[PDB]
Design an enzyme around this catalytic site. Structure first.
Site, short mmCIF file in Angstrom:
data_model
loop_
_atom_site.label_atom_id
_atom_site.label_comp_id
_atom_site.label_asym_id
_atom_site.label_seq_id
_atom_site.Cartn_x
_atom_site.Cartn_y
_atom_site.Cartn_z
N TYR A 100 -76.06 33.86 36.53
CA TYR A 100 -75.27 32.63 36.44
C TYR A 100 -74.18 32.56 37.49
O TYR A 100 -73.84 31.47 37.96
CB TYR A 100 -74.63 32.52 35.05
CG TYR A 100 -74.34 31.10 34.66
CD1 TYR A 100 -75.36 30.19 34.46
CD2 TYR A 100 -73.03 30.66 34.52
CE1 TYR A 100 -75.09 28.88 34.11
CE2 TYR A 100 -72.75 29.36 34.17
CZ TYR A 100 -73.78 28.48 33.97
OH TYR A 100 -73.48 27.18 33.64
N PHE B 194 -77.83 4.79 53.58
CA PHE B 194 -78.95 5.18 52.73
C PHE B 194 -78.63 4.72 51.32
O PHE B 194 -77.46 4.55 50.95
CB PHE B 194 -79.19 6.70 52.76
CG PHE B 194 -80.44 7.12 52.02
CD1 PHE B 194 -81.69 6.91 52.58
CD2 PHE B 194 -80.36 7.71 50.76
CE1 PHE B 194 -82.84 7.30 51.91
CE2 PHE B 194 -81.50 8.09 50.08
CZ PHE B 194 -82.75 7.89 50.66
N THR B 195 -79.67 4.54 50.52
CA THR B 195 -79.51 3.92 49.20
C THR B 195 -78.58 4.74 48.30
O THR B 195 -77.60 4.21 47.76
CB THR B 195 -80.88 3.75 48.54
OG1 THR B 195 -81.73 2.98 49.40
CG2 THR B 195 -80.75 3.02 47.20
N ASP C 104 -74.01 13.18 57.24
CA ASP C 104 -75.21 13.23 56.40
C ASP C 104 -76.23 13.98 57.25
O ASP C 104 -76.97 13.38 58.03
CB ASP C 104 -75.67 11.83 56.03
CG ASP C 104 -76.80 11.83 55.03
OD1 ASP C 104 -77.54 12.84 54.95
OD2 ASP C 104 -76.98 10.80 54.34
N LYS D 146 -85.38 18.29 53.28
CA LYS D 146 -85.93 17.79 54.55
C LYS D 146 -85.88 18.91 55.54
O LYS D 146 -86.81 19.71 55.52
CB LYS D 146 -85.20 16.53 54.97
CG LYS D 146 -85.07 15.79 53.64
CD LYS D 146 -85.25 14.28 53.66
CE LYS D 146 -84.54 13.77 52.38
NZ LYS D 146 -84.22 12.34 52.52
N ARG E 60 -92.13 -0.16 52.59
CA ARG E 60 -90.70 -0.29 52.87
C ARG E 60 -90.46 -1.73 53.31
O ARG E 60 -90.19 -2.01 54.48
CB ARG E 60 -90.22 0.71 53.94
CG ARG E 60 -90.30 2.19 53.55
CD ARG E 60 -89.08 2.64 52.74
NE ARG E 60 -89.22 2.34 51.32
CZ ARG E 60 -88.38 2.79 50.38
NH1 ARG E 60 -87.35 3.54 50.71
NH2 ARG E 60 -88.59 2.48 49.10
N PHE F 135 -90.59 -1.07 42.83
CA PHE F 135 -91.52 -0.39 43.73
C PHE F 135 -92.19 0.80 43.06
O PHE F 135 -93.23 1.27 43.55
CB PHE F 135 -90.81 0.07 45.00
CG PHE F 135 -89.73 1.08 44.76
CD1 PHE F 135 -88.42 0.68 44.57
CD2 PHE F 135 -90.02 2.44 44.72
CE1 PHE F 135 -87.43 1.60 44.35
CE2 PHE F 135 -89.03 3.37 44.48
CZ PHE F 135 -87.73 2.95 44.30
C1 LIG Z 1 -74.77 27.41 30.15
C2 LIG Z 1 -74.53 27.48 28.86
N1 LIG Z 1 -74.74 26.39 28.07
C3 LIG Z 1 -75.39 25.38 28.50
C4 LIG Z 1 -75.52 24.28 27.58
C5 LIG Z 1 -75.69 22.99 28.03
C6 LIG Z 1 -75.80 22.57 29.45
O1 LIG Z 1 -76.97 22.85 29.94
P1 LIG Z 1 -77.12 23.16 31.48
O2 LIG Z 1 -76.39 24.45 31.64
O3 LIG Z 1 -78.58 23.19 31.56
O4 LIG Z 1 -76.47 21.95 32.04
C7 LIG Z 1 -75.78 21.99 27.07
N2 LIG Z 1 -75.71 22.19 25.79
C8 LIG Z 1 -75.54 23.43 25.39
C9 LIG Z 1 -75.47 23.63 23.96
C10 LIG Z 1 -75.44 24.47 26.24
O5 LIG Z 1 -75.26 25.63 25.67
C11 LIG Z 1 -74.01 28.70 28.24
O6 LIG Z 1 -73.71 28.63 27.05
O7 LIG Z 1 -73.90 29.72 28.95
#
Ligand SMILES: C=C(/N=C/c1c(COP(=O)(O)O)cnc(C)c1O)C(=O)O
Ligand SMILES: C=C(/N=C/c1c(COP(=O)(O)O)cnc(C)c1O)C(=O)O
Ligand SMILES: [K+]
Ligand SMILES: [K+]
Ligand SMILES: [K+]
Ligand SMILES: [K+]
EC number: 4.1.99.2
Lengths: 455, 455, 455, 455
Positions: B70, B122-123, B213, B256, B380, B447
Site C-alpha cells: 500500500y 481536450f474533452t 499535457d 499513450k 470524430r 457516440f
Molecule cells: C484501503 C482500505 N479501505 C478501503 C475501503 C474503501 C475504499 O476502497 P479503495 O481503497 O478501493 O478506494 C471503501 N470502503 C471501505 C470499507 C474500505 O475499507 C483499508 O482499510 O486499508
C-alpha cells in the site's frame, strides 16, 4: 497473394545491430562458424525455425496453469487428447524434443544389420539409425537433389527405388520406412498424399513398418491443400489426420509446427511397442507422464498444435517465406526451388562460382551475410553432410546451400525486405568471399562446433 | 524512407479472421456503430492509441516483480527515479491515467473565475478546468484550424493571442497556460521547442504558471529532432528533458507514449503544490505511493517510458503512421494534413461529398471500412460532437473525420496495407456509401451506444 | 526450533477440496494405486520433490526474458556464469534434466569392463553406468543400511571398501567414483565434508576420477553447516563451493535443489572431456548452448540456484521436513531415521505388521493415506522393486516404505499437520488396513500402471 | 478448528528483516507514521488487506489474456456477467478502485443539505459524502463502539436510530442509507441478513434508497453462514446474492474480497442513475467499457470474485485472522472483540494505559511493533478519525486501535505466530511507548502523510 499477418503483436523484444567492425571480430571470434555467435549481437536470427517461435496469448495463459505433478498432470492429459484427436495415433509418449523421440524409435524398431529407407536423411535422425546398427538408404526421387528444378512435391518417395530395395534386400531386412514431411535437407519440400498412399500400400503388402517424421507436417498439409488436386476444399486438420492414417507411428519435434520453444513426442499404434517405449523413456527423458517436459510446456504444445491448424496462420507462414524467395529470385539471386515451407536456401554453388566444395563456400557465404547485414543463417552443405563412416571422406551432397530459416510469427515483411535487400547487395560483389578449412573437427555432427580458418 | 520494426515479435494475439458476410452481420448487430462492435470480431482495431500498446518482454518481466504494498512500493520508487531523470521535474504523483492527473491539477491550480489558455483543448482536460470555475481560451495559431494546410508545427501557440489575453484580463486572473504536446484536436500536430521557449519567457515575466499535457510528448520530440533546425544531433531524451524545462509541471497519460495499457501521473516543481497534491490524490486515486495503480503497472510504466526514448522505436512509430497517410494521399483519398504522430484522419465531409452532415458520413464511412476490411475506426464528427444542452440541436463541428488511430507496436506495414487498400477501394466507389439515421439515440454519450440504419 | 517461511506467497494454485467419500471413489478408479490418481483430485501431492517446486517472482520475471535462440542465448551465459561462480567447475553443459547428464557422463567416462563405485545408487544413474559396460560396486558405510540407526552423515563412503576395491581390481580398471549428495536410497542422508576430502585424497593418489551426483547438494550443505564441527561460521555457498572442489565433475538435476520444474546440467574441469561432451550432447539433448531446454528454463535455473544458497530458505526447507518426521515420531509412528533433507519415509513393514510383504503393505498404506487426508505419497517397496527378469519372482527389498516427499516452497506447516494427523489416526487403528492383490500387472514399470483390489 | 490452507503455493516472494537499529532510523525517517516506510524494509506487511492479495494461477492465466480494446473488450463482458450473476444487480460500471465508485455515487445520489446515514463511516466514503453537501449520521448500534464487547453482528444498523432519523429529518431529506459489509472501523464486524431485511423494509416504506459498501461482503457472508440461524445449509454465493437483493446498488472495492491488487466497480438497478453514471465515469475514470482499468485487470477481478465464493477459501481466510486473535487473547493482549473477518485490532487504550488519546498512543504503538518485530501495522484511532469541520477539534472515537490487517492468501499460520509472539513480548514492557504530537497535518485525510514528533 501475400496476406497480412493473421494476428496482432501482443508483446515485443528489442533488437539491435553492432557495427561491421565488431561483426567481423565476432565472426573471427567464432571461428567462421555461425553456430558460435552470440544472440545479443544478432539483428534478425534466421539460424533455425526450431524452438524460436513466438507463442500466443492463449499459450501463455496455458503457461500460467502448469500442473507440475510427476504423474496425472492435467497438461499431459490435454496434450494426449489433442494428439490423439488431430493425428489419430493410439499411443502418445512426450519427449523433451524431436531427437529424444528418435532415440527411442531407433532403439525400439531397429535390429542391427537391418535397413532404414527414407526420403533423404536428417543429421540427428540418421545418427540414431546408424548408432543402432541400421544402414540408411535414400529413396527420395532424384529430382529432390537438384536445387534449381522447380517441380511440385519434391519430397515424394521414389516408389521404384523402394520396390528395388525390397527385392534386393528382402522385406525382413528392412526395419521401417522413414517418411519425413516436409523434407528439410531438400529445401523444405512437401510430400503428396498420393505418395503417402502408395508408400502405405506397398509397404503393407510386405509387412514393413512406416514411421513419419512429422516435424513440419502442417506446412506439408498446406502444400497439399494448395497444389494437390482434390484437396482444395479440405481443412488443414482433415488433411493432417489423413496424412497420419498412412503411418504406423511418428516422431515429432513440437519445436517446429507446434509453435513452441521446447517439446516433442513419439506416437505409435502398436501396444507392445508402446509398452517398450514407456520402459525406455524413463531412462533417457523421464516418466511417461511428462517425458522430460515441465507441465506448462506440455500445455503450450497442446494449444500450439491446435493453433497450427488455422488455415490463415499456415497460409501466411508459408507465403511469408515465399515472399522472401520471390524477392531474391526477382533480383537474380540463385536459390533452391521451389521455396519450402520454413526457409529459403541460397545456392552457394551458384552464389560462389569461384569457390569449390572442398573450400566450403556455404560456410563462407553465411559468414559474409552476417558481416554485411547482421543476419544469421545456417550452413547446409558438405559440412552438415558429415563424413563417410567407413572411408572417412567427405559426404558430398549436390546441395551446398545457406539456409535462411524463418521462425514462426516472429518477423514481418519489412524484416524480409531487410534480409532480401542486404543479400541482393552482397550478390553484386560475390567474388570477395574466401574459402575455409577445418582447424577443429568433432567426431560426429561436426557442423555444430566446427572451427574453420580461411584458405 | 520507411524503416523496418526495430524489434521482433515475442508473442502474438490471435484473431478469428471472419469473412465479409459475417462482418456485415456483426456491423448490423452493432447498429452500424463501430463503438458497439465486440473486440473479438475485429481484425485490426484502430479505435484509439490509448492503452492499446504492446509491451516488451522487459515490461512483462517487471509485471512479475510487482510490489503490491500500500505504501513504499519499490515500483513507485523506480517510477519516481525514472520520471525525475527523464522529465526533470522535482515531484511526481502517480494516477490511474491521464484524466486522474487532470482532475488533481485543475483543483490545485485554478481559482474560480480565472482563465486557462491552451493550444486547443481536450474533452476531459477542458471539463476539469471548467468544472473548477475556469474559462477556457484557445490561443493556438490560426493555421491549426486549416485541415488541408501542410505546414510544420501546427500546434504552436500564437504568442500574440497569449499576450492579448494577459493585457485584457490581467496576469493575476490567469490560472495557468495549458500547452499540449502533441495537439490532439489538430490531428496530432507537434509543438516546436522555439514555441515552448517563447511561451516560458512570456509567462514567467508575469508570474503565470505553465503546465504541459505531455500525453504524446515523445512523438512531439521526434518531430523536433526531424524538422526543427539545430536538434538533428540531439537524442530523443535530451529533447524531452529540454521540453519540460520550460514548464512548471505536467499531466501525463502513460497509456499513450509510455507504452502501457494503464497508468498516468502528475509532475510538479513547486513544493507547496506537491504538498497539496499528496493531500488530494488520496481522495480520488489512492496513496501518493501507488495512486490508483497496482505496483506492477507503475513498474511497466517506468520501463516503458525509458523504452520510448529509443530513437529507432519512435522513428518507426511515426513513420508507420506516415506510411498509411502517404499511401492514402498517393491514391487521392482526402486526409487531414500534415499526418500527425499517432493517427491518420480521413476527411469524411470530402470522402462522402454526396452526403450531408445530418446523414452522418463519418459514422457511415467507418461502418463501411469495417465491413470491407475488418478494421475498426472512430467517428470524430457530428455524432461525437453531441447535442446542445439547451437547444437540443446537433453540435456541428467543422471537422467531420474518421480517425484511424495506431496503437504502438501492435500492427505491421502489411496491416497498414489492409487499411489503405480497403479504404482506397471504397473511395473508388464512394458514390455507393449510404447515409445513416438514428434508430436509438441515448440522452448523453451518444457516440458510445447509438444505433443507426441506412437511409 | 521450527522457523517460519522466509518468504510470503506471491500466487497460489487452487485445489478442489473433495470429501472422503469422493476420495475413495477416485482411489478405486485409480485401482488403489496412487500413481494412477489424477493431479486435479489431490490436495497435497507428496509423490516427489522432483520438478514440483514453487518458483519465486524473480524466476518468473526471468521466464519473461527467455532468449530462445538456438545458439548463443543470453540465458545460457547467465547459467554458465552462475554455475562457474557457485560450483567452481570450469566447463558446464546444460541438459533437460538429471538423467540426461548421466547418459552423457556414462558414455564419456566409462570403458566397457571397468568398475564404478558409489555410496549406494539411483535407478537411472546405475542404468547408464551398466548400459555402458560398467559394473557397480556399493562402497557406502554399513550403517547406511540400518533404517533405525540415528547417526549423522549416514551417506559417507567407507574409505576401506574403496581401498579394498582399488587393491583387488586395480586403479586402471576403475572408471570413476560416483559420490551422491544427498544419498536418496538411504532416506536422503547427507555426506560429510571430511568424507569428501578423504575420498578425493585417496582417488587422486591412484589417478581415479570422482564425479558427484549433486542433485540435493544444497540440503547436504545445510547438514554440514548444522552438524559438522568447524562449518558453523561458513555460508551455504562457501560449503557448496568447497564440496565440489573435491570432484572432477558433476551431474545435476535442477528439478530438485535449483528450485525449478525442469532442467539439469553436467559440469567438468577437464578440457578434453568437455570437448567430447559438446560433441555428444548434440546427439541426445541439443546444442551446448541450450541442451534440450528453452532459454527461459536456463534462466529460471540460474536464478533458482542462487536463491537456494540463502541460509534461511534451506534451513526452513530441511526443518519443515523435520517437523513432519518429529511429529510422527512423537506419536510412535515408525519412520526411517534420521529424517533426510527432502522426505519422510514411513516404515510400512512395521506400520502394517499384520500384513505380509506379498500383500503390498506400502501400496495399501499409501492408498489409505490418500482416502483419509487427500495426500498422495509414493510406494517404495515390493511393487516398485519389480520382478526378476529370468525367474519372474518379486524382487524383495529390505525397505518396505511409503515416501512422503516434500516439494520446495509449496506447502506450509499446516499442510504438514494434515499429513501427520491423518497418518497418526491411521496408525491408531492400523489393524484395519487391508492387504492388496494384483488385478492388473503390466510387464514392466508395474508401479506406474498396476491396479489392485483389497484382499 | 483452524484449517490448513485450501490451496498450494504456486510462486513466492522473498522477505527479510533489517536490524532494529535501522528500523529505528526508518521510523525516525518516516516521522513516526507507518505510512511513510519503505516496503523492502518490512518482513510481514499488515498495513492493509487492500490490494495486497495473492492471485491464483487461474487469475494469472487471465492476465495473459487481457483484451485491451477501448470498447467491447471480452474482459469487460466477463466481469459484467459475473457481477450480474453473483450480486444480482442490473447495471455495472467498472472503476479503478473503491473510492472511484464512491466519487460517482456521491455526485449522483446526494443533493446538498440532505442526510446520509450508515453503520459507522469510512474515511474516503464520508469525505465524498460531505464534499457533495451531505451530513453524515451514524446509525450503527451503540455496542459497535465498545471494543471489548463480544457480541455477534456488531455491524448491524440500529433500527430505532434509523426510525428517529426519518421522523426528525423527514424522508425527503435523506439521500440514502449507506450499509457497509463488513464494518471496517468497528473491527471488521458483520451485518446480519435479518438486519438487511429490516433496513430494506423500513426504507422502502418511505421511498429511501439503500446502497451497500460491498468491500468485504464475502467475509460478511461467511459470518452469516457460521453464526446466523437458518443459513448453515446455504452456500456462500446464495448468501451473497440474497444480501444484495435488499439493496438498490453498491460501491465495491475489488482490492478486498475480489482477490486482486487493483480494481472496483459501481452497481445499480435504476436505468436513469445508470445513464448518468456513464456520463460521469468518463470524466474521472474512463469509458464505461473499462472504467480506468486495463482489460487484464477486469479479467482478474471477474475470476477472483468467483474464487471468493469457495467456502473453504473464505473459511480459512476468516479463521486465520481468528487464530491470530485467539493467540493474542490467550496471552492477555487486549484486542477488539469479536475479531473481524480481515484484521485483528489491538486496543491501544488498554495496551497503553499511561498514554492519553491526545498523546496518540495508537500511532505510537504501531511504531514500536515494527521496531521490535519488523511487522507494519496501521493506526486506526483519533488520527484516522480526522477533525470536525465546523469546530476544528479532534474527532474523538472510543476506538483507539492498531490494525493488524491480513492480506488474502499471502501469509501462513507460522507467520501469524511470529506476529503474535512479537506482540506478546512487547506487551510485557508496554510502558516504554512514548506519546506523539503533530508536526505536519494535511487539511483532509491527515493520517496518510501526517508527520509526528515525540512528546
Ligand atoms: C484501503 C482500505 N479501505 C478501503 C475501503 C474503501 C475504499 O476502497 P479503495 O481503497 O478501493 O478506494 C471503501 N470502503 C471501505 C470499507 C474500505 O475499507 C483499508 O482499510 O486499508
Ligand atoms: C533443429 C533443426 N531440425 C530439427 C529436426 C529434428 C530434431 O528435432 P529436435 O531438434 O527437436 O531434436 C528432427 N527432424 C527434423 C526434420 C528436424 O528438422 C533444424 O533444422 O534447425
Ligand atoms: K487498456
Ligand atoms: K496493490
Ligand atoms: K515438473
Ligand atoms: K528455444
Amino acid at each position: 497473394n501475400y496476406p497480412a499477418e493473421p494476428f496482432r503483436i501482443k508483446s515485443v523484444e528489442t533488437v539491435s545491430m553492432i557495427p561491421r567492425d565488431e561483426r567481423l571480430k565476432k565472426m573471427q571470434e567464432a571461428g567462421y562458424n555461425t553456430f558460435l555467435l552470440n544472440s545479443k549481437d544478432i539483428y534478425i536470427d534466421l539460424l533455425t525455425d526450431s524452438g524460436t517461435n513466438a507463442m500466443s496469448d492463449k499459450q501463455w495463459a496455458g503457461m500460467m496453469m502448469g500442473d507440475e505433478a510427476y504423474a496425472g498432470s492435467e497438461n499431459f492429459y490435454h496434450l494426449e487428447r489433442t494428439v490423439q484427436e488431430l493425428f489419430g495415433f493410439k499411443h502418445i509418449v512426450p519427449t523433451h524434443q524431436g531427437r529424444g523421440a528418435e532415440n527411442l524409435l531407433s532403439q525400439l524398431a531397429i535390429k542391427p544389420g537391418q535397413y532404414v529407407a527414407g526420403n533423404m536423411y536428417f543429421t540427428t535422425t540418421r545418427y540414431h539409425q546408424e548408432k543402432n546398427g541400421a544402414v540408411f538408404v535414400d529413396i527420395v526421387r532424384d529430382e529432390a537433389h537438384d536445387a534449381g528444378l522447380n517441380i511440385a512435391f519434391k519430397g515424394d518417395i521414389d516408389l521404384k527405388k523402394l520396390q528395388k530395395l525390397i527385392d534386393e534386400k528382402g522385406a525382413e531386412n528392412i526395419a521401417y520406412i522413414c517418411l519425413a514431411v516436409t523434407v528439410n535437407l531438400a529445401g523444405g519440400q512437401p510430400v503428396s498424399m498420393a505418395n503417402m498412399r502408395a508408400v502405405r500400400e506397398l509397404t503393407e503388402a510386405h509387412g514393413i513398418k512406416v514411421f513419419y517424421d512429422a516435424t513440419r507436417c502442417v506446412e506439408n498439409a498446406y502444400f497439399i491443400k494448395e497444389q494437390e488436386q482434390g484437396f482444395e476444399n479440405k481443412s488443414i486438420a482433415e488433411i493432417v489426420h489423413e496424412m497420419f492414417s498412412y503411418a504406423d507411428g511418428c516422431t515429432m519435434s513440437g519445436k517446429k509446427d507446434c509453435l513452441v520453444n521446447i517439446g516433442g513426442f513419439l506416437c505409435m499404434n502398436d501396444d507392445e511397442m508402446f509398452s517398450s517405449a514407456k520402459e525406455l523413456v524413463v531412462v533417457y527423458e523421464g516418466m511417461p507422464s511428462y517425458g522430460g517436459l515441465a507441465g506448462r510446456d506440455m500445455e503450450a504444445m497442446a494449444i500450439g498444435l491446435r493453433e497450427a491448424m488455422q488455415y490463415e496462420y499456415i497460409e501466411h507462414r508459408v507465403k511469408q517465406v515465399r515472399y522472401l524467395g520471390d524477392k531474391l529470385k526477382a533480383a537474380g539471386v540463385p536459390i533452391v526451388e521451389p521455396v519450402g515451407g520454413h526457409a529459403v536456401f541460397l545456392d552457394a554453388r551458384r552464389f560462389c562460382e569461384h569457390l569449390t566444395q572442398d573450400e566450403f563456400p556455404a560456410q563462407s557465404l553465411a559468414a559474409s551475410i552476417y558481416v554485411e547485414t547482421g543476419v544469421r543463417s545456417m550452413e547446409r552443405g558438405i559440412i552438415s553432410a558429415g563424413r563417410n563412416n567407413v572411408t572417412g571422406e567427405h559426404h558430398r551432397p549436390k546441395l551446398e546451400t545457406v539456409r535462411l530459416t524463418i521462425p514462426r510469427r516472429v518477423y514481418t515483411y519489412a524484416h524480409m525486405d531487410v534480409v532480401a535487400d542486404g543479400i541482393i547487395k552482397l550478390y553484386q560483389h560475390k567474388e570477395d568471399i574466401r574459402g575455409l578449412k577445418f582447424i577443429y573437427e568433432p567426431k560426429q555432427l561436426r557442423f555444430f562446433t566446427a572451427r574453420f580458418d580461411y584458405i
